[PDB]
Amino acid sequence: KRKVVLAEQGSFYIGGRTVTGPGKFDPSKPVIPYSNEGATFYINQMYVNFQAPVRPRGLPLVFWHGGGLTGHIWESTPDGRPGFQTLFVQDRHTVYTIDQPGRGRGNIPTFNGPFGQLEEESIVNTVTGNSSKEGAWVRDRLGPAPGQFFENSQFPRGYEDNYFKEMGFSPSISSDEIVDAVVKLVTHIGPCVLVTHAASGVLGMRVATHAKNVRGIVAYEPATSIFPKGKVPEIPPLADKKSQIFPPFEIQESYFKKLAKIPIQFVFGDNIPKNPKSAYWFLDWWRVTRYAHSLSLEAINKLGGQASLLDLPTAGLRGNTHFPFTDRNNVQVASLLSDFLGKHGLDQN
Amino acid sequence: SKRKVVLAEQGSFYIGGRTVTGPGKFDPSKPVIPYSNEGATFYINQMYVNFQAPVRPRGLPLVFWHGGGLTGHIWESTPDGRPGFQTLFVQDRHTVYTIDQPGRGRGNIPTFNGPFGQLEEESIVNTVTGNSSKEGAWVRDRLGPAPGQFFENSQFPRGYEDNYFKEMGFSPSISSDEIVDAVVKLVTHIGPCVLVTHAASGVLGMRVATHAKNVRGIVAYEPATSIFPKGKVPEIPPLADKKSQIFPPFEIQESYFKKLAKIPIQFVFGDNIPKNPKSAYWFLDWWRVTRYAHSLSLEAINKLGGQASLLDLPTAGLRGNTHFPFTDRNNVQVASLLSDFLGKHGLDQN
Ligand SMILES: COC(=O)c1ccccc1S(=O)(=O)NC(=O)Nc1nc(C)nc(OC)n1
Ligand SMILES: COC(=O)c1ccccc1S(=O)(=O)NC(=O)Nc1nc(C)nc(OC)n1
């Protein structure tokens, strides 16, 4: 189950821009400590890893980590079982895994001075934000409160430290520049399928509207819904009657209509309440966010699309967290992804 | 195929680090976003580790440790897309570990809710960062004497400058002790192994070896900081500008320094390091004096009974290497010299 035969593997950087400091560079003057004087800095570039099997069949898969994550989540589970990278190379697909700008091996744009500041210009904010272990525990639905598990949980218990260690902050790079890097990658790859997660859900939808090479999307628990501009439906507040889900992203209808031209599947795990749950903010947030996505998919289908919501419990898989692809039953989750690819001919040459 | 690789297994994991906490208690009924430090536990300073194991490995696993401002990418591929040392050594029948050290790449960057690096009133890392420019890296890496220029003999993959410089970035002010600690923990997990280091990780790998008997050999590509027994640093001249000095050598207690005499150690240097003072080119002159300091460090290990050597790539018949010989155009020939070192010491046999 662990063996993999690669025709080739490697990694590269793509996307990004440059910014420049003031003045000139004199190679005769001390280079350390480093200075912005005469400086060119490459910023906002993305890291890309690829592994290609012998005799690939179908389109390459581009696995795009969720918020605060890296391509690690597709390589291995926290307890060291094979991730989707290995499983899909074994399923005969070329597999690309990225670290988006601002995350992991992607660029974090900072210079000589306060974080993110190039002289007078703020490239990214000096003040950061970052979830705690406790916030991630409830966001990911391991259980209703930190340290508590749902009885049915598929989480690899005992490997909590390993799991939370994979998460971190993201600097305030604009979403436009993140989308731009992935559009450039899709242009480089050719026809492909995006497999997204959480924060990369809305970003992958945007990429597809800019890149006809995206031939399908599977999004694991996307975090932000998308609608045509001016056509956001009524979405309730949370059960606390004060909080809202993430403001839906709005795009011009001419771009939104491109989503109707490819198969799209959103995949949700378990333990999302059907009814308001004021005691558990993130559980209630997932209830309303899932509802908003159901409306987003319906809007795509009213434009002639083929956009579906797969609830893993309906497929017979119980207890999945917000990371179904690293849960204990991730092989069965992968089988459902192979099923989607096969139905839509994305596993054939 | 030159690109074909057969893995018995591959994967990645996190190791090392500690936790820090914010004040107060976490209430799951209160809005979790925007993120707060209240009731928070944060995992900080952990390291990312990737491994690829061949079918039936022969000899010790290799741990490739990137230089300053880099990541494990530099061992995966060259800027122009040729195989890196990860592929070459898996093909050479060694299990290969590649790390992103704490503060770099997939390793943790310790920041929270607040100004960068600050957890309430505690400064975990500095808010003010430092980072080289393209121009600083060009001369540090000896592509040529000035940005845009290449040495006549250059092995750099010319035309792929954008790819190359895009791989570099800043490092937060994590203590070197905590970086060493994470790698010591990895070495405990792996068992007997060989460290292959680069630039900034040179001195760190020497330190790891003094804390971890499982390090059975070191190959260091152009280490940046020299190491000596405490209060035994030899006289080292200032640079030709009569103002600058090399990096202050690291000093360790002699009982730890002596551990370096028990294992084979090779430092590898590329080309275009001047023999004589060069006041017009600061980094070239810096490399001249830094290489000299390393020659004295290796001599101090040998005087204690060690097995330390300096491999100048031009003396081995390889001309034009930069500060990254393992991604240069002749990196296959550089790899053959690493295989030679491993074979000489039996580190390629079980
Ligand atoms: C791994 O799971 C997630 O990606 C994820 C999933 C659900 C909620 C939060 C996150 S996240 O915090 O970690 N990433 C994210 O999308 N956060 C976010 N993004 C935007 C654009 N705005 C706001 O605040 C309004 N928060
Ligand atoms: C890949 O090349 C190198 O690794 C490398 C190579 C040559 C010089 C410098 C570096 S470095 O940029 O990372 N720095 C390093 O080794 N640590 C460090 N950094 C600074 C800024 N100051 C001091 O001490 C004053 N030490």
Residue numbers in the entry:
A (entry chain A): 12 to 360
B (entry chain B): 11 to 360
Q: What text appears in the publication on this structure?
A:
SulE, an esterase, which detoxifies a variety of sulfonylurea herbicides through de-esterification, provides an attractive approach to remove environmental sulfonylurea herbicides and develop herbicide-tolerant crops. SulE catalyzes the de-esterification of a variety of sulfonylurea herbicides, such as MM, BM, SM, TM, TrM, EM, and CE, to the corresponding herbicidal-inactive parent acid. The structures show that SulE is a dimer with a lid loop in a domain-swapped β-hairpin covering the active site from the opposing monomer. SulE shows a similar catalytic triad consisting of Ser209, His333, and Glu232 at its active site.
